[PDB]
């Protein structure tokens, strides 16, 4: 009942949600479920990468730029 009205994939374990979506896509021989899974997975990937950069947004960005320019 709790998971009914409360979404999970935005949880910190987004990698696990992506693994579950990949498993659901692979388990299905129907192209409609595969395309819905692909869309959901791409959306969750974009959301998680955005959040990762946002937390990476400051100081993490700075040390990434320094390592990449240093090499």
């Amino acid at each position: 009942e709790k998971e009914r009205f409360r979404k999970a994939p935005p949880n910190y374990a987004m990698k696990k949600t992506q693994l579950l979506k990949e498993k659901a896509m692979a388990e299905d021989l129907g192209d409609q479920d595969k395309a819905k899974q692909i869309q959901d997975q791409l959306n969750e990937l974009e959301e998680r990468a955005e959040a990762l950069d946002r937390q990476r947004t400051k100081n993490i960005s700075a040390i990434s730029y320094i390592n990449q320019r240093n090499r």
């Binding site: 709790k2 999970a8 949880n11 910190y12 374990a13």
Partner: protein
Amino acid sequence: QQPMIYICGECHTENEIKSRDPIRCRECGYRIMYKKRTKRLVVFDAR
């Protein structure tokens, strides 16, 4: 009246786990959870 609060390993949600109870997060159902820090006096010297 202390219900023994635990912290879900995945959700980081607090969970009340009294005796004779299965360990599951009531949010995720995840089976690993960690005790919260003590309430006693933690004092260090900074030595």
